[PDB]
Symmetry: C2
Amino acid sequence: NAMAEIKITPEELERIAGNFKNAAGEAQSQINRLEGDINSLEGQWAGATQAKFRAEFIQSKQAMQQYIPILEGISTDLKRIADKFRN
Amino acid sequence: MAEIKITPEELERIAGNFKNAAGEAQSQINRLEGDINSLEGQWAGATQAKFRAEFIQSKQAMQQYIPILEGISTDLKRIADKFRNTY
């Protein structure tokens, strides 16, 4: 039987791709603000305390460094399909 | 201008930033999951499966990130409480 037709438009795929790209940017911005917060505590208490918080925060950075490229990959895969559908 | 001295109020402010960030992160992954869900039945199953698999990867990174932020919030609050009970 005939292959089952596509209902999604390239424009809609591109809108969702935009949501993923923008989410990735928001995520990076968020971690940047939080990093500023941790930075601000340095020198205002014991170095050992600051080190504990820096280490915890770096863990969150590492998780975000996994997350962001996945979102960007999804965004780009969506755009690649929209382009293929359109042309 | 002087560097801002640490107080329980400062630690609570920063703890709140981490807590709010966790909530914003949960909201983001929820919205993106909604987007992936909306593609169901709109194109081929193999295509949907691919994007679902990629998305689940991002969700898993997020499920690591969020508790790390909540941990930092808790640790900051712990210290704020210690300062109040003993800047």
